[PDB]
């Protein structure tokens, strides 16, 4: 059960208590842990990381690493309450405002928030093409949903993202094909005994921050659990060729 904050900032008492009741149940130390934080008269102010800025002294791999590092400093959100609401069908202009709000509130983010932030921080670099990569996976009788931000620059594929697993987020710009990047996520999921049920490739996200256009999250959908790799490759390669055309 995952909650999304629909109260803005400061978080309302209803959402705030619900988050605390959730962490007290999931945690074996429960109330002792909760009281230690909530009743502490003095709590140390966490540092606000600086929003990274693109410099001519940087290569595209350097700039992507700086963006990823900022996302890592914000931290993966393990509270069970997602702080910023991401409406997938929303025009990009709206989502860029939420991206700016994330840099101002400076709180932990989940996978979706990280994709929107990644788009936001790469809008100014025209050689970098961005597109969402969505996975529906299976593990221990349940389905999981995850999103990363696919990158294409100078004949190489990579990704930016946030996940609780180090191998399911950022990938360096070394993949010669889209298929190599996807297959790497599939092999990375394997480490966690997940079966990739679906792969969804969206369209290249416009670089215009005030775009009326929503993000396209599913131009290509593949049932990779029912397919052989030669066929997943064929499909992914036909589509990536079209993206570059």
């Amino acid at each position: 059960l995952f909650h999304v904050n629909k109260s803005g900032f400061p978080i309302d008492s209803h959402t705030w208590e619900r988050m605390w009741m959730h962490v007290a149940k999931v945690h074996p130390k429960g109330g002792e842990m909760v009281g230690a934080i909530r009743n502490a008269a003095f709590l140390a102010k966490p540092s606000i990381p600086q929003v990274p800025n693109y410099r001519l002294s940087m290569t595209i791999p350097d700039w992507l690493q700086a963006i990823q590092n900022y996302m890592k400093t914000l931290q993966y959100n393990h509270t069970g309450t997602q702080f910023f609401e991401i409406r997938k069908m929303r025009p990009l202009s709206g989502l860029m405002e939420t991206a700016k709000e994330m840099t101002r509130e400076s709180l932990p983010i989940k996978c979706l928030e990280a994709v929107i932030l990644g788009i936001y921080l790469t809008n100014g670099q025209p050689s970098i093409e961005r597109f969402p990569i969505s996975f529906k996976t299976y593990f221990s009788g349940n389905y999981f949903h995850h999103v990363v931000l696919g990158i294409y620059c100078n004949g190489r594929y990579g990704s930016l993202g946030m996940s609780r697993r180090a191998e399911l987020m950022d990938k360096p710009l070394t993949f010669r094909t889209l298929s190599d990047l996807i297959f790497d996520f599939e092999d990375s999921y394997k480490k966690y005994l997940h079966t990739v049920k679906k792969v969804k490739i969206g369209l290249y996200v416009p670089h215009e921050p005030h775009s009326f256009q929503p993000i396209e999250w599913k131009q290509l959908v593949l049932n990779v659990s029912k397919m052989l790799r030669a066929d997943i490759r064929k499909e992914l390669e036909k589509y990536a060729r079209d993206m570059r055309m």
Binding site: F9, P10, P46
Partner: peptide, 28 residues
Amino acid sequence: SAQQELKQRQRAEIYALNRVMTELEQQQ
């Protein structure tokens, strides 16, 4: 002025709680 104070308290608790939950997930 009082409004930004609750946000600063909530952020300090969010990161204090997130440090704890990361560690819990690390174990489990």
